[PDB]
Amino acid sequence: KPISIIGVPMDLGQTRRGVDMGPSAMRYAGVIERLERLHYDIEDLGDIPIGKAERLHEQGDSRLRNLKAVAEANEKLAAAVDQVVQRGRFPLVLGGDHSIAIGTLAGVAKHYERLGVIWYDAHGDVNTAETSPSGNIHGMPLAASLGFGHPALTQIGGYSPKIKPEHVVLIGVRSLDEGEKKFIREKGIKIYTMHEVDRLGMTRVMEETIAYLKERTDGVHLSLDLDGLDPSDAPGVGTPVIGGLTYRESHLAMEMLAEAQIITSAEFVEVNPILDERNKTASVAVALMGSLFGEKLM
Amino acid sequence: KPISIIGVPMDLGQTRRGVDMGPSAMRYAGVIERLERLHYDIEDLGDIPIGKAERLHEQGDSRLRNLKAVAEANEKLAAAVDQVVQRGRFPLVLGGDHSIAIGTLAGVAKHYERLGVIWYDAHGDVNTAETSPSGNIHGMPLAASLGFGHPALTQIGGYSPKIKPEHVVLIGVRSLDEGEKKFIREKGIKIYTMHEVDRLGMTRVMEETIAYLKERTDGVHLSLDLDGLDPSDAPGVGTPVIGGLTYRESHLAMEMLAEAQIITSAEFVEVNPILDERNKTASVAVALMGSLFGEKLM
Amino acid sequence: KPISIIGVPMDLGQTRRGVDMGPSAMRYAGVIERLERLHYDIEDLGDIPIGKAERLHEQGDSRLRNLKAVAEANEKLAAAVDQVVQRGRFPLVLGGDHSIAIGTLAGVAKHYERLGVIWYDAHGDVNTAETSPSGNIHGMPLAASLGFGHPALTQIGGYSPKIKPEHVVLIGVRSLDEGEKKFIREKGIKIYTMHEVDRLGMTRVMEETIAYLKERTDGVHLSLDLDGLDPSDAPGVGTPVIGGLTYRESHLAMEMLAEAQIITSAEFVEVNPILDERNKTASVAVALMGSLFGEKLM
Numbered sequence: 001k002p003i004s005i006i007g008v009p010m011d012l013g014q015t016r017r018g019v020d021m022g023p024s025a026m027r028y029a030g031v032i033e034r035l036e037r038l039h040y041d042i043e044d045l046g047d048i049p050i051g052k053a054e055r056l057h058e059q060g061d062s063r064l065r066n067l068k069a070v071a072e073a074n075e076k077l078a079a080a081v082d083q084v085v086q087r088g089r090f091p092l093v094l095g096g097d098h099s100i101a102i103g104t105l106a107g108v109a110k111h112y113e114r115l116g117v118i119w120y121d122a123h124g125d126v127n128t129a130e131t132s133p134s135g136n137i138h139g140m141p142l143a144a145s146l147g148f149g150h151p152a153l154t155q156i157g158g159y160s161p162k163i164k165p166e167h168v169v170l171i172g173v174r175s176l177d178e179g180e181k182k183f184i185r186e187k188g189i190k191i192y193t194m195h196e197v198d199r200l201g202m203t204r205v206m207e208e209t210i211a212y213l214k215e216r217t218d219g220v221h222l223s224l225d226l227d228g229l230d231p232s233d234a235p236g237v238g239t240p241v242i243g244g245l246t247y248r249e250s251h252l253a254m255e256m257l258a259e260a261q262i263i264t265s266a267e268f269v270e271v272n273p274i275l276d277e278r279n280k281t282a283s284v285a286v287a288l289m290g291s292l293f294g295e296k297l298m
Numbered sequence: 299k300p301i302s303i304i305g306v307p308m309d310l311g312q313t314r315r316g317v318d319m320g321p322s323a324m325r326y327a328g329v330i331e332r333l334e335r336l337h338y339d340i341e342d343l344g345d346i347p348i349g350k351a352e353r354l355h356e357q358g359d360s361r362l363r364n365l366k367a368v369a370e371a372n373e374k375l376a377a378a379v380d381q382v383v384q385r386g387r388f389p390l391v392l393g394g395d396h397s398i399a400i401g402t403l404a405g406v407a408k409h410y411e412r413l414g415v416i417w418y419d420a421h422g423d424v425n426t427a428e429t430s431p432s433g434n435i436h437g438m439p440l441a442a443s444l445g446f447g448h449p450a451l452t453q454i455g456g457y458s459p460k461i462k463p464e465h466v467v468l469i470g471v472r473s474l475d476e477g478e479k480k481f482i483r484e485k486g487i488k489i490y491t492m493h494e495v496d497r498l499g500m501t502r503v504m505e506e507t508i509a510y511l512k513e514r515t516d517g518v519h520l521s522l523d524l525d526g527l528d529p530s531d532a533p534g535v536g537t538p539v540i541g542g543l544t545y546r547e548s549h550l551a552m553e554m555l556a557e558a559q560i561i562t563s564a565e566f567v568e569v570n571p572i573l574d575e576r577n578k579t580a581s582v583a584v585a586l587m588g589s590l591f592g593e594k595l596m
Numbered sequence: 597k598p599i600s601i602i603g604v605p606m607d608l609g610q611t612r613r614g615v616d617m618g619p620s621a622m623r624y625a626g627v628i629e630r631l632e633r634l635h636y637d638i639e640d641l642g643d644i645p646i647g648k649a650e651r652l653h654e655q656g657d658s659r660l661r662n663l664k665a666v667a668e669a670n671e672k673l674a675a676a677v678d679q680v681v682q683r684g685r686f687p688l689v690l691g692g693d694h695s696i697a698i699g700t701l702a703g704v705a706k707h708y709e710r711l712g713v714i715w716y717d718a719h720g721d722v723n724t725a726e727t728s729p730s731g732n733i734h735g736m737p738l739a740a741s742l743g744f745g746h747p748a749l750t751q752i753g754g755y756s757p758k759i760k761p762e763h764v765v766l767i768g769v770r771s772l773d774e775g776e777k778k779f780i781r782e783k784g785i786k787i788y789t790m791h792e793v794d795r796l797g798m799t800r801v802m803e804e805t806i807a808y809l810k811e812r813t814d815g816v817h818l819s820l821d822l823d824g825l826d827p828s829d830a831p832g833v834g835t836p837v838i839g840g841l842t843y844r845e846s847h848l849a850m851e852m853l854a855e856a857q858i859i860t861s862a863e864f865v866e867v868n869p870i871l872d873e874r875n876k877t878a879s880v881a882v883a884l885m886g887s888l889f890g891e892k893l894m
């Protein structure tokens with residue numbers, strides 16, 4: 001299936017500037033060339049125009065920083081993504097902080113009876129204005145897409161929820177706020193924290209993950225946050241957490257998903273060139289994209 | 299069985315100068331002392347005299363750079379190695395780029411009904427003048443040993459092929475040229491790329507490898523290319539490839555081979571002091587040799 | 597009946613290179629011109645694409661050299677010949693070593709209830725992998741067509757055998773392997789060695805041959821190997837044998853066949869320009885073809 005790249009230069013979902021440079025950092029890391037080599041009909045639809053956020057002061061919720069700019073950008077993203085899917089193409093969204101997942105899922109989900117989600121991340125991203133300790137919207141996209149949160153975020157695309165909790169699998173988690181641990185526990189979301197990764201091994205985690213979703217979804221969206229990898233492998237992220245997944249574990253995961261042929265959409269987020277070591281993180285993202293799309297060693 | 303060390307100061311198999319210093323770097327990294335401690339009768343036969351290759355433009359060799367010099371040095375190596383085996387000693391060859399495998403296997407194979415080969419490397423080294431993208435002979439030793447390539451290389455020692463495809467096991471591969479992928483596929487060579495190492499685990503890979511060769515060979519030659527380890531573990535190599543085997547995985551491999559008692563000859567190649575970090579790579583090689591030769595933690 | 601020429605530039609059936617130049621040597625010798633003069637609707641379908649054999653050391657059995665390439669080439673030939681017959685034309689096949697008879701007979705035989713065969717040769721070509729003293733497939737086409745040999749050769753065309761031993765007549769034989777003498781003896785194949793040609797005379801041998809086949813077949817294929825003539829008359833052959841048939845004996849034979857009107861298909865093989873004296877052998881072939889197709893002195 002032909003691919004369509006959409007860049008979302010977003011940084012309003014959090015506070016470290018530079019994550020808005022992720023789309024071009026990955027383009028510069030050679031994402032087009034990489035995918036063209038795999039004989040893909042790759043197309044670059046450019047970037048979603050993001051508006052500058054109103055200053056905190058006259059702005060409404062500190063528990064929902066930059067809500068309007070974030071909500072509007074995601075509206076545009078949802079539309080762009082919706083059209084790509086309608087055109088029969090695979091939407092590959094490049095971020096940008098994780099709050100863009102709200103728009104990506106808003107444009108994809110409407111097209112599936114039961115869309116599953118693989119949330120590759122160090123965080124759960126299931127906070128609300130009530131549970132969020134930062135007010136950073138990049139820490140709320142999964143909950144908002146599950147129908148939990150401010151209507152400005154939950155109603156993107158004119159419908160909700162975008163997905164069901166039983167159709168979500170979290171991988172590489174190692175930093176959850178108390179409210180989030182409770183949310184995960186109660187909504188019954190499937191999750192493999194680093195303990196399970198260390199205990200079971202990435203192979204078993206991926207096998208179980210793929211089998212689980214394949215048995216109850218009709219499309220799977222890969223929401224890959226680069227901070228899911230160890231800061232040593234992916235240094236250029238705004239909210240890094242030590243003791244993460246390795247470069248190899250990430251490739252195996254992508255390779256196993258490629259093989260499974262279950263990934264119907266994807267987004268690579270949180271790449272921040274301004275916090276990286278010579279574009280290393282964008283590079284990792286591009287390599288991981290290659291594996292996801294079927295690149296093989298043999 | 300007594301060991302005989304033969305240094306092969308070869309760099310004509312590729313383009314990065316310095317890999318000819320590999321033999322002395324490893325000697326300086328303490329190869330003799332290491333092996334003597336395991337109570338071996340270790341002997342150092344010095345180095346094979348390598349002649350400088352004539353100008354590429356003057357002698358015909360571009361898809362086969364330095365063919366004359368590489369072919370003759372390997373002739374000498376073949377003889378030296380043949381004699382060591384005849385004397386009832388184990389030939390431990392220190393390189394030198396990987397093209398020296400052509401001479402080592404040329405002197406060992408004639409002594410075995412079915413010699414097996416474990417090719418520990420990031421590459422397959424199964425290119426021919428036709429498939430080679432570089433013209434570097436260090437990327438052709440395995441194919442040449444299997445009887446595929448220029449006669450100047452396939453006929454070293456007055457016979458061919460030195461080994462059969464079904465008796466070869468590649469491990470750690472993560473960079474194969476298209477022609478090579480096809481070669482491996484068609485010749486039916488057993489291979490464990492990094493995907494299999496990540497998926498199955500080094501223990502499994504080594505168990506399967508040892509059992510496979512043990513069931514159908516009468517001797518096994520270990521051709522260990524230091525670039526099979528990750529560049530962070532083995533930085534001093536001319537053609538590094540990221541996402542490689544770890545220091546520990548390599549020690550386990552060597553430890554399990556020692557245990558199986560199947561390795562009848564070996565060569566440690568691609569050590570280049572001029573691209574290393576304080577002889578780190580020669581050091582890893584020496585350590586790995588200690589394990590191979592039975593060194594144990596307990 | 598219109599004629600259709602099909603060149604089969606094959607030399608994989610034996611070891612002397614050059615016999616693949618036979619088709620063009622005969623064309624240059626003027627085969628088209630010769631036949632057009634007899635007012636035939638002659639058509640050249642070009643040549644069958646022949647692949648390059650795989651390395652001898654990687655081949656399955658040394659008693660069946662180049663089996664794959666020889667088997668595949670014969671598959672294409674059988675198809676080409678089959679179609680010619682279907683179009684109501686006479687297939688005239690130009691070789692190429694004698695292994696091509698396997699393809700020719702595979703395309704013709706299916707169209708007859710009882711196809712007879714006249715094998716004009718110094719050899720019997722009835723060897724198998726077991727009885728072959730050379731491993732050369734050009735020494736096995738008759739046996740394989742009789743259904744005896746490797747399935748790769750006996751099953752060309754999807755059926756077997758192509759002919760019955762009682763419908764075969766050998767002429768000019770003077771070099772048979774022991775296994776072959778036994779085969780001919782036991783399968784009860786009719787044969788006129790040079791002893792019979794010297795004792796009875798070519799006229800009697802032909803009279804007897806034509807009457808024998810005419811009484812029990814519905815079509816006769818002429819498999820004329822140029823080495824059936826004496827090396828003085830036909831020097832350009834890879835496996836010459838002295839004391840063969842003369843130029844005149846061969847013309848008489850062709851003249852008596854034309855008269856008999858029994859030949860429904862034919863092939864002229866083993867012409868090798870690289871072992872000839874100024875295209876002398878291709879020239880004899882062409883002349884012989886002229887007589888076969890009715891050319892007369894008066």
Ligand SMILES: NCCC[C@H](N)C(=O)O
Pocket residue numbers: 098123124125127132133134135136138139140175176177239
């Ligand atoms: N996307 C990262 C979210 C970080 C943190 N758990 C928060 O809610 O602020």
Ligand SMILES: NCCC[C@H](N)C(=O)O
Pocket residue numbers: 396421422423425430431432433434436437438473474475537
């Ligand atoms: N020994 C390294 C070889 C690398 C590459 N396949 C080449 O043939 O150039």
Ligand SMILES: NCCC[C@H](N)C(=O)O
Pocket residue numbers: 694719720721723728729730731732734735736771772773835
């Ligand atoms: N077509 C020539 C055959 C020669 C010999 N009888 C052989 O089997 O090699």
Ligand SMILES: [Mn+2]
Pocket residue numbers: 098121122123125138225
């Ligand atoms: Mn996230």
Ligand SMILES: [Mn+2]
Pocket residue numbers: 121122123225227228239
């Ligand atoms: Mn994260």
Ligand SMILES: [Mn+2]
Pocket residue numbers: 396419421423436523
């Ligand atoms: Mn190598």
Ligand SMILES: [Mn+2]
Pocket residue numbers: 419420421523525526537
């Ligand atoms: Mn290598």
Ligand SMILES: [Mn+2]
Pocket residue numbers: 694717718719721734821
């Ligand atoms: Mn013959």
Ligand SMILES: [Mn+2]
Pocket residue numbers: 717718719821823824835
């Ligand atoms: Mn003959």
